[PDB]
Write an enzyme that holds these catalytic residues in place. Structure first.
Site, PDB file in Angstrom:
ATOM      1  N   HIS A 149     112.035  -7.556  68.298  1.00 64.69           N
ATOM      2  CA  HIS A 149     110.924  -6.705  67.911  1.00 64.69           C
ATOM      3  C   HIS A 149     111.186  -5.940  66.646  1.00 64.69           C
ATOM      4  CE1 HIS A 149     113.033  -3.603  70.539  1.00 64.69           C
ATOM      5  NE2 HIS A 149     112.740  -2.863  69.483  1.00 64.69           N
ATOM      6  N   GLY A 206     115.652   4.406  67.894  1.00 61.91           N
ATOM      7  CA  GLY A 206     116.602   3.769  66.998  1.00 61.91           C
ATOM      8  C   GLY A 206     117.827   3.206  67.693  1.00 61.91           C
ATOM      9  N   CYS A 215     117.834   0.644  69.797  1.00 59.07           N
ATOM     10  CA  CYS A 215     117.727  -0.765  70.149  1.00 59.07           C
ATOM     11  C   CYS A 215     118.803  -1.568  69.427  1.00 59.07           C
ATOM     12  CB  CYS A 215     116.316  -1.288  69.835  1.00 59.07           C
ATOM     13  SG  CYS A 215     115.131  -0.635  71.043  1.00 59.07           S
TER      14      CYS A 215
END
EC number: 3.4.19.12
Lengths: 300, 298
Positions: free
Chosen positions: B39, B141, B143
């Site tokens: 993503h 942030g 991920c």
């Protein structure tokens, strides 16, 4: 909330083992110096009542085996600073981080990299108790494991492990070899003073609760710092210092709740109990999260 | 006894930053490949229903900015495996450890290295819950943060972070890009299945509390495995298998407390409560220590 340790890699790159005879523990290799607990020079029987100065005078550089992994680091100098040994070695550690040696106050938290034979096993967060013990997880061979905080790129070393007390808690020194609290590196029975609750951290935890919208316990009163301190001691809570008031400043500003107003709310919790209510999904007040810790986990 | 994470240095040396447009998260750089959540290629609009294969085919190697410290790494190819993007780079990571990719079972534990902008920020121990969430500490942030175990000198990567659920728990994938659980990498409010407590882990932890001199919760009673499992399931605890009983042997031996005697203690705790008392500091039964986690530390 979670107990969260700092990433340990910068400290892993500094761990070595130090052996005298059959006695092995861990050391910290920074630039061309290795720091370690001086009781490495003790036989098991010498630990009962050691004369460290006499034991050291019988030692030479070539009696110290310092290893990074299986690679020997040659010792070219030795001296004793309080309860730590400084061994000068012929190689500067290429993995040396930016670092500082700091002496922490009770209440402050730090990460421990538990090591055996120079090899890291685990990392976890510890709080320095008001009686100058920590609740570590330390087995035989763990001495010389260090505690640290990491600010930006800089590792502040604050703890080096030396002993276990009869109650199962742990004691040690700063990196200048000065014990925290009233302990000595003799294998004699020593008692920690009665422990108390870390008030500054409980207040940090209340701020944390308010930041997340849990604020039933906020009351309309305030207090003086002296009045709060005298009441708190009756509940086995630590008195607050001016430095504690200062380190709550950022959370006070973030929430707009003055420190002494939060103290008044805490006092009412102590005097009237929780009355069955919970804070942050708990009827227990947590005292091992510092104000810095609360910030790290509400935004890092 | 303490909740203990693996030393994180071998993983720190692999974390990089990955940016596509105005989205930035972390990647894992092993040899000449960087792994990250797919993503990152999404915009704001794409969030709600991203057709990933369609969004991916419209991207070029140069749309991916990968930074390791002060250095940019040149992306020379990209592919997608399930929910993870694989960016080939022109540089091999010299700090790549011995590694393997594993898919973990619910009830197993792992260390998380939480990272922001490619930079390690903290390390802590988590377990794969039976409903395939993890109770993590992950902010914006985070991920591409990974979870792992270390055996000998070998890092087994088992988790990559992708999302937070409205209850505040977390979901992600293995390093093949398959989610743990019924979750989907689309920007929607998702609920999990009913969580249950990891019973073998609670027992392991009770054995730990005994080892450390804490035995107020014990009792002279015993129970059969099936009768224990009836009560466990009533309280949304996972059933205990005979393999779980076997796994608990070493702790039993060490303490001389038969597994089914500890089950009787836990049954008593479930039905009565702790009555204010605590165990190893906790006012609640802890279920994110495995039997292995307890023995290694004892």
């Amino acid at each position: 909330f979670r107990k969260m340790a700092f990433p340990s890699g910068k400290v892993e790159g500094c761990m070595v083992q130090v052996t005298c005879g059959t006695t092995t523990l861990n050391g910290l290799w920074l630039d061309d110096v290795v720091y370690c607990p001086r009781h490495v020079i003790c036989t098991s029987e010498d630990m009962l009542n050691p004369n460290y100065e006499d034991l050291l005078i019988r030692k030479s550089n070539h009696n110290f085996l310092v290893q990074a992994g299986n690679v020997q680091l040659r010792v070219i100098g030795h001296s004793m600073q309080n309860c730590v040994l400084k061994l000068k070695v012929d190689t500067a550690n290429p993995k040396t981080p930016k670092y500082k040696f700091v002496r922490i106050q009770p209440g402050q938290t730090f990460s421990v990299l538990a090591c055996y034979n120079g090899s890291p096993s685990g990392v976890y967060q510890c709080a320095m108790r008001p009686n100058f013990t920590i609740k570590g997880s330390f087995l035989n061979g763990s001495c010389g494991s260090v505690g640290f905080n990491i600010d930006y790129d800089c590792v502040s070393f604050c703890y080096m492990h030396h002993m276990e007390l009869p109650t199962g808690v742990h004691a040690g020194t700063d990196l200048e070899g000065n014990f925290y609290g009233p302990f000595v590196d003799r294998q004699t029975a020593q008692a920690a003073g009665t422990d108390t609750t870390i008030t500054v951290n409980v207040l940090a935890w209340l701020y944390a609760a308010v930041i997340n919208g849990d604020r039933w316990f906020l009351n309309r009163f305030t207090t003086t710092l002296n009045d709060f301190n005298l009441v708190a001691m009756k509940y086995n809570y630590e008195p607050l210092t001016q430095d504690h008031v200062d380190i709550l400043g950022p959370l006070s500003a973030q929430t707009g709740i003055a420190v002494l107003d939060m103290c008044a709310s805490l006092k009412e919790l102590l005097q009237n109990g929780m009355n069955g209510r919970t804070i942050l999904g708990s009827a227990l007040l947590e005292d091992e999260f510092t104000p810095f810790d609360v910030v790290r986990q509400c935004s890092g």
